[PDB]
Design a protein around this ligand. Structure first.
Ligand SMILES: Cc1ccc(-c2cnc3c(N[C@H](CO)Cc4cccnc4)nccn23)cc1
Ligand SMILES: [Zn+2]
Ligand SMILES: [Zn+2]
Length: 386
């Protein structure tokens, strides 16, 4: 991005040059956090209402407080001849940079609110231009500066990557790779928050469209796939034209009515299994591509028909992915009973002790002992009722 680019401006040169670059951009970034606080946050408190400040700036002050201490510890480690303790700074501050979670989640809606407050008031609109002049001579608006903290967290792993490449001492190279991994994890934490928020928006849209559904879709996990299909059942053997929404825990069978969809059948995937039918084959005919969805006690069996082989293939992989998410490998290992969970507060995995990243269905919780864990960590968790 152009705004970040403009704001941030021998074999062992490269190694030493990278250290200067890291320290320079960190000072430049901490001053930018200071600029938002002094030139925008304190003067706008006299204009905007307290709730508007809370929404637009979020925890910006706490970010500045964390980076003030980070730049101080960075300077001491880089200062000492050798800079061998630099890796320890990045490892310690990865856990301190958790404060970014709240920021990353709320920043898009803070930008939207800032636009609304400025559009409604020429008074605020003129004060926003005034602040930009006193801080950066109008080169950067508050709108662009509030997006800078997010651009910055995604740069740390690109900075340490270059430093690792140009480090020749095998022990310092190995220690810096631990700091590089920890920074690569921080960049993944951002993606999980953006990705989960987009899922939460998609769910909201589906609630609007689906009629006669008297339940929140958030209870069924993540949307998998949605689309037209033909359906058959044991008691009604003729193909019914339908629209289906597949989420991790449920399949909704609806009837399309322009934009609106009327719920006809609710299928709870905890009790159902997928069975392939290769009979409709070699893409012979439209609507001949079928698989079965059978209830685990033989109570019901649905035949699902799709227009093409490509479509049927895609739906089958998504049903497999959904049932694997309800019932993952080692879900009942060591006395536990791990089930899909959406965590409100910041939580760590009982097995690897790492964060359950994101804002929606981040992992699993055993209902018995209440231990939290990642999908791939279930078998490693301590036995239920230690
Ligand atoms: C740079 C960066 C660092 C960390 C994050 C980040 C990613 N996921 C979380 C998290 N998740 C919890 C569930 O454990 C729910 C939750 C989510 C968001 C806010 N508050 C609570 N807690 C703290 C931070 N988190 C994102 C970006
Ligand atoms: Zn884990
Ligand atoms: Zn348990």
């Amino acid at each position: 991005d152009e705004i970040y680019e403009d704001l941030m401006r021998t074999e062992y040169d490269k190694r030493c040059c990278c250290l200067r670059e890291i320290q320079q951009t960190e000072e430049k970034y901490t001053d930018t956090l200071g600029s938002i606080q002094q030139h925008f946050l304190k003067p706008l408190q006299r204009f905007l209402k307290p709730q508007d400040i809370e929404i637009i700036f979020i925890n910006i002050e706490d970010l500045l407080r964390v980076h003030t201490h980070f730049l101080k510890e960075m300077k001491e480690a880089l200062g000492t001849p050798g800079a061998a303790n630099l890796y320890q700074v990045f490892i310690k501050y990865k856990e301190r940079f958790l404060v970014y979670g709240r920021y990353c989640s709320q920043v898009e809606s803070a930008s939207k609110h800032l636009d609304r407050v400025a559009a409604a008031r020429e008074d605020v609109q003129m004060k926003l231009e005034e602040c930009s002049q006193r801080a950066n001579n109008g080169r950067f608006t508050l709108r662009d500066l509030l997006m800078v903290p997010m651009q910055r967290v995604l740069k740390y792993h690109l900075l340490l990557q270059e430093l690792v490449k140009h480090t020749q001492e095998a022990m310092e190279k190995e220690n810096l790779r631990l700091a590089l991994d920890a920074m690569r994890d921080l960049a993944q934490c951002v993606n999980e928050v953006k990705r989960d928020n987009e899922t939460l928006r998609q769910i909201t849209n589906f609630q609007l469209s689906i009629e006669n559904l008297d339940q929140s879709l958030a209870h069924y996990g993540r949307p998998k796939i949605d689309g037209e299909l033909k359906i058959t059942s044991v008691e009604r053997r003729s193909k019914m034209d339908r629209y289906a929404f597949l989420l991790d825990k449920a399949l909704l069978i609806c009837k399309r009515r322009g934009d609106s969809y009327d719920l006809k059948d609710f299928v709870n995937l905890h009790s159902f299994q997928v069975r392939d039918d290769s009979s409709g084959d070699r893409d012979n005919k439209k609507w001949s591509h079928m698989f079965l969805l059978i209830e685990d006690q033989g109570a019901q069996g649905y035949e699902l028909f799709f227009k093409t082989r490509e479509l049927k293939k895609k739906w089958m992989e998504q049903f497999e992915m959904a049932i694997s998410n309800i019932y993952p490998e080692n879900a009942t290992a060591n006395g536990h009973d791990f089930q899909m969970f959406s965590f409100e507060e910041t939580t760590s995995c009982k097995a690897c002790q790492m964060l359950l990243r994101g804002t929606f269905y981040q992992g699993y919780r055993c209902h018995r002992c209440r231990a939290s864990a990642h999908k791939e960590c279930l078998g490693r968790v301590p036995p239920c009722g230690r």
